[PDB]
Ligand binder design. Structure first.
Ligand code: 409
Ligand code: 409
Ligand code: ZN
Ligand code: ZN
Lengths: 409, 398
């Protein structure tokens, strides 16, 4: 089932014609986006990345210098102020290079790993738009690594390791990998492309990763390893990408002082792990058919009463779970228990805590899941500890559950 | 002390002529921005706000409907795709109404408090640009509260209480309040403006806030309370603002079913507490002269060895502090300890931990501060607990 239908069902986002391919993230979809940012940040910390933010627009002159204007013109939105023309950024790399270019850099500063949740706009043909998977405004979990020639192997290897490490959290382990080689419109010499292409192929080989070439699909500035994930119709979507660039730094006058006090141009590795937040959310939505892992679930727990008699109890518990950091909602409606459960199941809420008279008495809760399972009564404190552990460990599967819902086995 | 020189010295941000008023946040400046986002979110959690994200641009037609095109044209950047013109948003409000308009609403949903860290672009004349205080691309800690007429007083009071609550964290001694009334170009009837201006004046007086009128300086859609803060040269900068709007929702066909079954247009309150992150960071930078309180400091601790004898111990402590949630770096360079200390001192790192042989043997650390205070030898868990406490409490000094 399509992520667009599931997105409406869970009130995650919408789009209008007033803004084709521009996403409106509602509260619950934004919750997912934000949790993914937190997850990526935990990895940026561990793998020692800076995190920056570059501006939305820069002078067209800068975009001409990179080769974007010649090779990327059709896709760029432009605007102007006071007789000067600006491009809304389609990529974050040039901004990163401008940051690099502030202050003298030395070999001591390398590898310099510079991440950004970088908002890009690309004027994708309106015929090619597709839900969250192909929009016009999207946010990459981007980074550029500025390094020496001698550091390419280790740094490309690090990016590859990070892809599998992050994808394993979602249960994606058998990943389809491509090496996209020099496109017809490109900058840089043949010799530079032969080297960059060999370097990426050797890294994949060294990591024992099977891949195929994809002829002519590289970026204008360098070849790309692509990590493909599949949607519900098995369409291939580029998500992770690791790219090797011997051209942009030089075009933008990037340099550092080497060990012999000579001026050197840094190599730049580009990579995104999730790809874009929008595309990755669309993929997860379809793969899990909206059964997001508890850490990602917009609403983690719903606590419900049978009658008005338990309203006070449900309210205390909701407050208690909320202070414990759990995303929790009360459902106090005069509706049958089965009716409530069906609704919150369609809403894909991991856990539903049913409070009848006996629950109020014993200070317990009757626990149901969105997979139709009855986990009996549990102590409130026990439920809290078990949920907190499920959240903190970013567990793919629920209490007492063998297999989470996922389309591709 | 000017935030622009401090921002250069502490490697917080830069700007270039290839992008006038367009900020490049470097790692250390972005850390401050991110910490302010965490703080705002924690406050909006208690005050029960949703948090959304609206599109960066929308059809010019939408901005024509709201009155932005006729009353706000010169400030807006525009762009095109496939023969249709788009405005890059200068405000988040119309996007928020669009989200409100998805799904039937009733009185049960109100007050609906909808927050966004909303990136706006405004084509400010280049002669008016000034460091971080007045840029062309900035992010508001914005929100719109959709409510009934009967809820206006409580909701305006709630915004005012939020401003003072959040501002107390930063210790601002001079908060000057203005009430900005109907401008020359506006939407809404004179009667609507009478009511809106009175509601804000009454809210200020009930909250015991002295204020001055700023005649004709209100927004095109409503009057504004402004919470003014002052930079090093005592120049006035609008930061917090609370505005009362009886017009935009109607122009955008917003409605809900009331408790009495009558379908009405919601009132909308616009507010920002910090103002923009950029402007507020410029203010903080001058307010503290770059000596950010620990919770905001880009790097909270640097740990140094005297010689490589203590390298291993320094790495161990660095990992230990980092796991404790502290922003900590190891400085293992082959430089004299007095050279390393001076560098981190000038960088305004709150705490410096020095490890020589005596510290390794004892499992302690020698602690000094960026103000030159020497706290002597401290046990490691005690420094961790103290730091965590001062971070969690967002303490103004220590
Ligand atoms: C990895 C970066 O440093 C590199 N500069 C780059 O942009 N590479 S990319 O063009 O291959 C790339 C990387 C990640 C995401 C996308 C992408 C492109 C278009 C999208 C779209 N139109 N809608 C949704 N997601 C999208 C993601 C592209
Ligand atoms: C509170 C909002 O819902 C309201 N729609 C609004 O934008 N009001 S505002 O125009 O008074 C306002 C509010 C908050 C920040 C700014 C502002 C404007 C320009 C800036 C600039 N040019 N540079 C830096 N910060 C800035 C902040 C303006
Ligand atoms: Zn790039
Ligand atoms: Zn507004």
């Amino acid at each position: 089932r399509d992520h667009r239908k599931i997105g409406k069902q869970l009130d995650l986002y919408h789009m209008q014609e007033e803004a084709p391919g521009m996403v409106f993230w509602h509260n619950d979809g934004w919750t997912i986006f934000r949790e993914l940012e937190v997850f990526v940040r935990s990895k940026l910390k561990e793998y020692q990345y800076q995190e920056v933010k570059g501006p939305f627009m820069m002078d067209r002159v800068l975009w001409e210098k990179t080769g974007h204007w010649d090779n990327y013109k059709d896709a760029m939105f432009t605007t102007s102020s006071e007789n000067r023309e600006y491009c809304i950024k389609p990529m974050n790399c040039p901004g990163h290079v401008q940051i690099f270019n502030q202050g003298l850099k030395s070999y001591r500063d390398l590898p310099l790993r510079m991440a950004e949740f970088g908002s890009c706009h690309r004027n994708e043909p309106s015929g090619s738009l597709h839900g969250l998977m192909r929009v016009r405004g999207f946010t990459q979990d981007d980074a550029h690594i500025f390094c020496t020639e001698e550091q390419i192997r280790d740094e490309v290897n690090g990016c590859i390791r990070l892809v599998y490490d992050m994808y394993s959290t979602f249960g994606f382990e058998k990943i389809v990998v491509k090496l996209s080689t020099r496109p017809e419109k490109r900058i840089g010499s043949d010799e530079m492309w032969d080297r960059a292409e060999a370097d990426l192929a050797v890294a994949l080989e060294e990591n024992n990763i099977p891949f195929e070439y994809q002829l002519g699909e590289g970026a204008f500035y360098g070849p790309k390893i692509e990590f493909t994930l599949y949607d519900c119709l098995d369409r291939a979507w580029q998500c992770g990408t690791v790219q090797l660039d011997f051209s942009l730094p030089s075009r933008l006058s990037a340099s550092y002082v080497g060990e012999d006090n000579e001026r050197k141009v840094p190599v730049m590795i580009h990579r995104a792990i999730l790809g874009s937040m929008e595309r990755f959310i669309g993929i997860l939505t379809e793969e899990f058919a909206g059964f997001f892992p508890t850490w990602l679930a917009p609403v983690q727990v719903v606590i419900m009463n049978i009658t008005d008699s338990q309203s006070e109890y449900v309210n205390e518990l909701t407050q208690k779970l909320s202070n414990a950091g759990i995303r929790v909602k009360a459902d106090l409606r005069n509706e049958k228990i089965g009716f409530k459960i069906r609704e919150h199941t369609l809403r894909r809420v991991p856990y539903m805590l049913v409070c009848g008279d006996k629950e109020v008495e014993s200070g317990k809760v009757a626990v149901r899941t969105r997979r139709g399972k009855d986990l009996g009564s549990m102590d409130v404190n026990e439920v809290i500890e078990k949920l907190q552990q499920e959240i903190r460990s970013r567990s793919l599967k629920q209490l007492e559950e063998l297999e989470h819902h996922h389309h591709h086995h």
